[PDB]
Amino acid sequence: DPNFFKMVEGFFDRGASIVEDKLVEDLKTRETEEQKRNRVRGILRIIKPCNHVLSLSFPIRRDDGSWEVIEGYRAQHSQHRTPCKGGIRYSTDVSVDEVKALASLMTYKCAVVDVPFGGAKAGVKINPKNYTDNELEKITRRFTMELAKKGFIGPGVDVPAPDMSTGEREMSWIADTYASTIGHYDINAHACVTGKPISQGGIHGRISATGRGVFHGIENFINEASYMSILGMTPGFGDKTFAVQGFGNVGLHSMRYLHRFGAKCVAVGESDGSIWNPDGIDPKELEDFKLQHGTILGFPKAKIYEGSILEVDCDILIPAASEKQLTKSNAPRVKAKIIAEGANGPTTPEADKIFLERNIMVIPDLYLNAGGVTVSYFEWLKNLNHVSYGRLTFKYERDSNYHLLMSVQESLERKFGKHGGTIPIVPTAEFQDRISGASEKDIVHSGLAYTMERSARQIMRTAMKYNLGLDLRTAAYVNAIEKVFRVYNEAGVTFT
Amino acid sequence: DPNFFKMVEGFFDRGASIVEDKLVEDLKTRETEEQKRNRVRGILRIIKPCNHVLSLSFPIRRDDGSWEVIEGYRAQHSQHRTPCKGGIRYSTDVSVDEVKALASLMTYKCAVVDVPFGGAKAGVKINPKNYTDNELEKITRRFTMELAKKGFIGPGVDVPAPDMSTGEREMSWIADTYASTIGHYDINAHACVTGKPISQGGIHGRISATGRGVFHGIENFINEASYMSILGMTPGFGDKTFAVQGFGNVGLHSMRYLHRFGAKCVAVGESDGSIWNPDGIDPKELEDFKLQHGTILGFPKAKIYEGSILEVDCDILIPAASEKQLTKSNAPRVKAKIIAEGANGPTTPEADKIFLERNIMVIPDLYLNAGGVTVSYFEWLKNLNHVSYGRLTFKYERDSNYHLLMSVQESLERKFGKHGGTIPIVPTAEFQDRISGASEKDIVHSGLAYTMERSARQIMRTAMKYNLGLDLRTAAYVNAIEKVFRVYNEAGVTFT
Amino acid sequence: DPNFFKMVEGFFDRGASIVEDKLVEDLKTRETEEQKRNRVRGILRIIKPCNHVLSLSFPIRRDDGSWEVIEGYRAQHSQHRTPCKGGIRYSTDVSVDEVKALASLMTYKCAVVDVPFGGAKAGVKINPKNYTDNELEKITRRFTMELAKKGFIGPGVDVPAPDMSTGEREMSWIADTYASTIGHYDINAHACVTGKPISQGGIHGRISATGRGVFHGIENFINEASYMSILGMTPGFGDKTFAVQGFGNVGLHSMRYLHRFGAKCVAVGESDGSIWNPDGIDPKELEDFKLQHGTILGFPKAKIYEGSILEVDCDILIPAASEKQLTKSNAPRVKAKIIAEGANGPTTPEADKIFLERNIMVIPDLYLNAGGVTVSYFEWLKNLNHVSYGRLTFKYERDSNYHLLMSVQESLERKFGKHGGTIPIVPTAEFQDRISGASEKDIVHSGLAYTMERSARQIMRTAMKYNLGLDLRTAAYVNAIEKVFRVYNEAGVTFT
Ligand SMILES: O=C(O[C@H]1Cc2c(O)cc(O)cc2O[C@@H]1c1ccc(O)c(O)c1)c1cc(O)c(O)c(O)c1
């Protein structure tokens, strides 16, 4: 746990130095000096800092009747894209310099995965356990309100999302508040927030989103030996053990869908304990260990283990909990060989230099948990379209398929003069399930893969153009910076 | 060696403790517990901190073509009144904790003089000498824009003002920006800022406003020996020497109008040096020492003097420059007798306990320069009325008087049989000039006096109610607190 | 008789038939038919029904956690004047037809005193004693919301007021909600409801409003002998007695001011008993029977009397309590000479043809107690002008008078050799306290006073045109109608 603050500011500067030659060479203009350096040196000094960042403070009535002040923050990084976006967090750790960095990170995350959004982030310095459910509703509903009055919430202005100990039911309050007060007259009022439950205009598949993101991100890597020929290991994805931190939302489903494919587990940790089992624990059982009683503490197969969470002899480690759990106190340790950032910045630049020198591949959060916002993107789009995806183009498409297949049948039955034998009316077993169980989530799942997979091409191409090889982090930010630049370059200085 | 931030936080807490008794006493309800404290002890915890405060960051291009980032801040303290009020500052000293304190100060300043405004403040971390006029316009107009976006400028939401290094021309750009872009459709668009020049919707007597405020504030004190029977010093207002710091806007007319009434000067200081002359210098001459040359440096009868500005042998000192120039390094000094705070918070709580223990009169900024916003109030009101004051009720007044006077004539020539003798048609010499040189200016001066004078009564009543005597500072805040509390107590916790 | 339902429908229709001739006569257009009647006969049928009325149904939840559906209504009668006006009511009495009726009343009521307000009224079908204060805030707060989303609360659209069991604190919740959700961007947000407390932007004189309205309505008839040469009685206002009913708010001030000026009392009684004393009870002592005890029961000189309240021998009877206290069961007696309707229509058309046929004067509530909304009208304007009336023109007008008084003195001290002898500097003792105690009240009471005086001069003129002599009721509505008609006529049929 370092002070740092400038955690993300280092990576930008790192990626910034290398594109200083590309932008001056790719820009086609009539200025042609070396003040080209001076324009670009200026353009990057604008993207670095957050353009707006509102500090807040509002009172509420506890169930006592006692009165308490609540500090809250929200930072819009860039506004190159019309709507900023980023989750909101409820924890005592909440700091001003926190969201100022996190919102910055969200800008480049949206750039990597070609999501037309600006980076944003918020935070409330409370502790959610210490308040009731009735107490916590008034915090969110009024936090909503005090943000709409100053233009930090609304479709096309800013769209927040859930995060640390923030769930669907809370976003539902956000929506219900905005659609009943300020954004009343707005048709797309319910689009003010992504992550709301499905009866509230949500989308199928974001419950899983960060998980499949964790999954699809790892998938596009241990299926290409171009990075195993250096790291070692086996393209045989199966027999690989993993360990998660922070069993919650991102922690569950990064495991719920990682197990499915034959990849065993070995450990699970929360904010008090850990688990150790070389046989491989199964979320089949231990998932009814949440509110069934309360807090994890071991179970059948689940042994009580303490020391830390990383430590354990493993392959794939995912610190999907709080922030900066990896520093020099533990970077030369970690009996692992590939790390994947499920949470936002658990790896510090203090540790990358060590990992890089030990041939350990850390999957950057800037890429990995980008599925969450990519689907968030879709959820937003859903509310602007006011239709479940495929709600009109399923029967037309499944009827078009069934006519197409039979068309090859009958076309095969006149070259074959008896009409009755051939039968291609039946599609393959996988495809028959595709049009019988056709829903909205299938569109989302395929779009998530098409966005995720094509983004890994944008990295593993820009990494092999600069010999980064294993440092995909400095290969990620160097692609996002280039995408946000042209957005500023081709927009021109605005004289207002 | 000044001190840190909490500047005003101590004064509120200082005044807050003594109202804790009468608030539970004057409150008339069926609540009736000792929880009366818990409501009130809670209500005060809401008023202390600023409710909103936007940190800004916007880019501009110098006349170079070079690009520079400009950090900008703005704090709305309270929102108990529908609009917030507070000037904006242009200086490298600009800090977040600065305006946060200053905006707090403005809330109570507007409460002392019964001005239905909420406190606010802003600042721009630049240095105006280092930019051109063409360069500085871009800052203001852009800064305007980024504030209307997030709702920190607009009539009935937040109205800024000029301050130090900010003049009428800049307020004119503010207005011209707001009235051509965001608030175009607003009828009262030009009401978004007070302090603008007269051809742009200002008000006569505002150029002088802070000055007359300094004057009438001092006037209501050396006109009653109930504070000279303890301080010493003659009620004969004339033969009193004064010295000003910061020959700029507030420094000028706090002297220009103070000299008028027969009060000798002795010293004037700026950011370079000072002046020392026991005969008394005259603004009639050394006022053409601004842009005529550029900076002060002595003149005929103006000698070069250094050392300091405050220690000079004087009676009335007015630190009308930056902030906190009176601390432990100079409080047990100052060869003065009565000090008057022309700028915002030049006396620290570190210096009051030294001044009070030596029987020295410090006139609180919370009250002194309140004329500045009191006229600001009027200028705002002018734009919602869209008439210069008296623009219709002058000839009706001047004609009604002349009919009234001849009515006493014609009624006195009836009891006196000759019809031609008596002549009360003519008013006193002073009243003849009144209805001849009648303008908007006069309605402002009389309303400023009426507001100012009645405020001193609300203080000197609540001062000897608690045996404060010489510490009118704590008699000021103790009066403003109870005015804002009433606004909060009778508005109720808003479930939103 | 329409004892509850079409309560006023008789009054309109009865008044409607009368104006038929004048309107076609007063009509100056190029029509010139017998179809001129068709125009007016239709236009009146436009005014008779409330053109809009919303029936509501919104839920809450009590301190228990249980849930209750709340019915509510609000009726916007006319929209000829841009904002609509009328209080809200919190009783089980509340009925669709009830508010649909009282809204009609408020239209013509605010057309007699010449107030540019359209008529409206609202109600909520509950009983406040059954709900806690906390429970009553959320009812009030959300009732506001559901009226704004549908356009029934807002300056220039519709402005409510207090009334039956509706206090200032409740009006304070209406504003705080409207001004914090829908009408946030509105400068006149808090101008959406009148009757709110002082600190929240109220006006001085609401509490004392209807009492003065009663008195000035009285004053404009015992001072005109046109209506004493037919009723009898001495115009000599002095030695006359009055009997009140409903010793509260309207009752107190209607007596306190009526006595102060010369009238003697005789009787007082509320929902318990009555007092009898032809010596004349004095309100300056018996008013400490309020919450100092709990209810009336008589006191020294205050006899314990039964029977009723009205039949007491007296001259001036005022029913300042509930609805309908005068029918065929008491009209053939009540040996009084004049009845002023302190409440809303305590006199039935089942009793006017007894009072009219007995040469008694019943003063319409259409004009008398209309002194509450006219002051409530001023409070609206205060919230619009954001200034206490005369905040600026108090020291200016006080300074103007002394200069006048000295102008005559100095004018008289020159035709007389010595300079200082004469002393008209001091004005009359009644005038000295006027400029000494000059406050908002004095302006409201006058603006009130001139309003009904002109109004009375407008009724008594329209009555002497149709020989109504004693039917002020039908002489009252007959006036408001032509005003409402003239608005509609010169506007035309809106083709939308
Ligand atoms: O609308 C689109 O415009 C983006 C296209 C684009 C790109 O392909 C490459 C690149 O290097 C920059 C770049 O700029 C835009 C952009 C997008 C997202 C951001 O966050 C951001 O700052 C800027 C878009 C989106 C897709 O997904 C597509 O497949 C597609 O063809 C177009």
Ligand SMILES: O=C(O[C@H]1Cc2c(O)cc(O)cc2O[C@@H]1c1ccc(O)c(O)c1)c1cc(O)c(O)c(O)c1
């Ligand atoms: O509309 C008026 O309401 C203010 C009257 C008032 C008062 O006289 C004393 C007090 O202790 C509290 C208080 O509350 C209101 C207020 C005003 C200004 C603020 O900043 C603020 O927070 C609250 C007003 C304004 C005048 O100038 C008057 O002369 C006048 O009679 C009434």
Ligand SMILES: O=C(O[C@H]1Cc2c(O)cc(O)cc2O[C@@H]1c1ccc(O)c(O)c1)c1cc(O)c(O)c(O)c1
């Ligand atoms: O702007 C004003 O127009 C009103 C003046 C007026 C009138 O004097 C007599 C009449 O028969 C009709 C009439 O039409 C208007 C009106 C006003 C109020 C209503 O409710 C209503 O339906 C219609 C006004 C208001 C005043 O208070 C004045 O003193 C004044 O000179 C002018």
